[PDB]
């Protein structure tokens, strides 16, 4: 396979219309990953899942329960 990009010409990877988190960065918004047989694919990364927040001039969400988390720095 041959594909052409703002980052240059990429050989031996399959370009796809899907989007995922960035696995290996190529440049200019494209990433590459090993996926299904199993192959190297190249794709435009997605920044995250969309969420239209349920805003209204009289609506509020209150937490009913909590989590304690421990995190490492």
């Amino acid at each position: 396979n041959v594909f052409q990009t703002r980052a240059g010409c990429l050989i031996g990877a399959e370009h796809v219309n899907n989007s995922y988190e960035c696995d290996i960065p190529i440049g200019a918004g494209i990433c590459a990953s090993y996926q299904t047989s199993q192959s190297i694919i190249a794709y435009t990364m997605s920044l995250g899942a969309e969420n239209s927040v349920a805003y209204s001039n009289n609506s509020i969400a209150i937490p009913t329960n909590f989590t304690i988390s421990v995190t490492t720095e």
């Binding site: 349920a54 001039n57 009289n58 609506s59 509020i60 969400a61 209150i62 937490p63 009913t64 329960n65 909590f66 989590t67 304690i68 988390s69 421990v70 995190t71 490492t72 720095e73």
Partner: protein
């Protein structure tokens, strides 16, 4: 209390599994410093245009006035290599210094004390932290409260009663769809509207969204 203790005790177990399954920030400092040193040693066998990289060898095959113009090239090339290494080490020391000043700030504000600074002591609301030692570094275990399951509710800025507008002292007004309650705004715990929960200010005309309701006045039955 028992639930909160169980969640905490459970969370520590996950840390232990994660570390026994990374420390890249520390490891790559050790790797960078080894690379600089091995590169210094490799520069010794370079010629810099001299006939040999060994001074004893130059001195074995040349007389002093010819040997010195060859040896001056090795001195020039090795000085250039040390000037390069010391310069890069000074620049790395400035990064490690900035990181150590950050760590001393997290020790002061996250381990001593509790911090209001958003995302300074890990994500979520900060509860407390614990230091652990590591080779050439430090590890902070940040304990944080994270609000979880949540419910949609109807809400209003103020409550109109005897033509007075009432505001909550320490909470938010919410409705289950038929009744009005006041609650604390990080954890759902509803209570009836009272003069102990509220304060008045002016009449009902000025507040943009305001809903008619009753405020309880708790001594009124106790007149009996």
């Amino acid at each position: 209390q028992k639930l909160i203790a169980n969640q905490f005790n459970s969370a520590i177990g996950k840390i232990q599994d994660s570390l026994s399954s990374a420390l890249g920030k520390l490891q790559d400092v050790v790797n960078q410093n080894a690379q600089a040193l091995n590169t210094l040693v490799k520069q010794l066998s370079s010629n810099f245009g001299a006939i040999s990289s060994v001074l004893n060898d130059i001195l074995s095959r040349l007389d002093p006035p010819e040997a010195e113009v060859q040896i001056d090239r090795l001195i020039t090339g090795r000085l250039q290599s040390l000037q390069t290494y010391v310069t890069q080490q000074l620049i790395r020391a400035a990064e490690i210094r900035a990181s150590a000043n950050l760590a001393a700030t997290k020790m002061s504000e996250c381990v001593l004390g509790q911090s209001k600074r958003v995302d300074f002591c890990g994500k979520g609301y900060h509860l407390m932290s614990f230091p652990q030692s590591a080779p050439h570094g430090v590890v902070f275990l940040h304990v944080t409260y994270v609000p979880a399951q949540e419910k949609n509710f109807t809400t209003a800025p103020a409550i109109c009663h005897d033509g007075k507008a009432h505001f909550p002292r320490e909470g938010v007004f919410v409705s289950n769809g038929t009744h009005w309650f006041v609650t604390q705004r990080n954890f759902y715990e509803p209570q009836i509207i009272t003069t102990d929960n509220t304060f008045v200010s002016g009449n009902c005309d000025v507040v943009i969204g305001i809903v008619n309701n009753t405020v309880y006045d708790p001594l009124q039955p106790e007149l009996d």
